[PDB]
Amino acid sequence: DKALANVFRQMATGAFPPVVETFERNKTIFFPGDPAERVYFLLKGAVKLSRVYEAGEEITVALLRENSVFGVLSLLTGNKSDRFYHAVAFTPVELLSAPIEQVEQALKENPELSMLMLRGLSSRILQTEMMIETLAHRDMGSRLVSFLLILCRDFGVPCADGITIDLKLSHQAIAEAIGSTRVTVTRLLGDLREKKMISIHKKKITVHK
Amino acid sequence: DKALANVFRQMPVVETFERNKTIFFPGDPAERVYFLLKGAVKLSRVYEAGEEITVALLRENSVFGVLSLLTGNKSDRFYHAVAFTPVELLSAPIEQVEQALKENPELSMLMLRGLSSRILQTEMMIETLAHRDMGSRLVSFLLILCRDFGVPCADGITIDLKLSHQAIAEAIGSTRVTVTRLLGDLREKKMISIHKKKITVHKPV
C-alpha cells in the first residue's frame, strides 16, 4: 500500500530497489559471524532476533513483528563488518532488503527516511523491552506465559474464550525463544492446558485472557 | 561529546538530582527531553502487570525521555528514570523537540546514534537479566558497569561510581542482602575489591 510504496521511494538511489525475499519457517535469515551486508524490513510473519554475547551464549533479544527494521545497527555504529546477531524466520516470512551502503546513501539529507528509521529503532527498543520482561522471570513457566502474551499482542485474534495467537507454533521454536528445551515447553503447555489457561487447535494457541 | 552538543543545538534548564532521586515517574506524561552531562541514570519500565524492571543504564551524553514521544506514549510514560548516582543534566520541553523533529531535517539523523546506543544498552540488560541465578546476574551487571563507567587500573577496572547494595539489588531484581553476600563472596575470592565505596574488578576478561 501507500506506506510500502513510500519505502521504495525513500530508498531509491539510482540502482536496485529493495528486494523482496521470502523465508520458510525456521530458516535463518542471517548468521552470527556472517558479513553484515543488508538491512531488512519485515513485511509478513515474525522474525526471532537473538544476539551472541561475548561469553558466547545466544539469547533472544526480540520477537519482531511486521513493519520492523533489523540488521541495521552496524550502519548506525562505527565498527561494521561482522554480524553478532542471529535472525530466524519464526514463522514463514516475507521481507524487503537492501545493501547497507544503499541505506547509508539514501539516508543522506533525507529527513523522511531518517524519521522512518527513527520510528523503526524506537519499535525495536520497545520489542527488546518486552523480551526483558519475559527473560527476567527466573522460572520457565512464567517466561512461557510472558512469551505467549508477546505473541498475543503481535499476532493475536480476539475470540469468545480469549485471544488466538494466529501462528502455527512449534514447541521447539518456543523453547528456543525463552531459553528452555522443547521437552520443558511441551510439559509447561500441557500444564497450562490442563489448568484451562490455554487451548490448542491446529497448532494455534488460544490464551483464555 | 561534541556529538551531544550537536544533538542539543538542534532541539531550557540545567538540573541536578541527588543519588536515588527520581527524574521522572511512570504514569506522568512526557514533558521534557533530557541530555545527560554527569553521572549515571537507571531507566526502568513498568509493565502491564505492574512489575518494574531495569531496561538500561545511561551514561554521560545519553539523550533520554524522548522514546515515549517517538512511540505515541507522550500522554503517559511507562518509564521511571532515576539518578543512579548524583546526576547533572540539561533538559528541554518536549513540545520544542516535537517542533524541531518536524522542522529541522538534520535532527532525526543525529538521533539515530542515540537510539542505537539505547538498543545496545537494553541488550546488555537482556544478557544480565536472562541469568536465572543471582550470582551470574550480579557479575554481568558489574561487567556492564565496568564497560559503561570503568577506569583502567593497575588492579584492573575501577567502576567510577559509588553504589549502594540496595541500588544494585533494585537494578538486578534481587534483595539487598543477596547483593551484600554475593559481593562478600566476590571479595573473599579476590575477584573484586572495594575501596572508598568503589568496586574494582580485577579481571573482567
Ligand SMILES: CCCCCCCCO[C@@H]1O[C@H](CO)[C@@H](O)[C@H](O)[C@H]1O
Ligand atoms: C528495504 C530495506 C531498507 C529498510 C529501511 C526502511 C525504513 C522503514 O520504516 C518504517 O516504515 C513503515 C511503513 O510506513 C512504518 O509503519 C514504520 O513505523 C517505520 O519505522
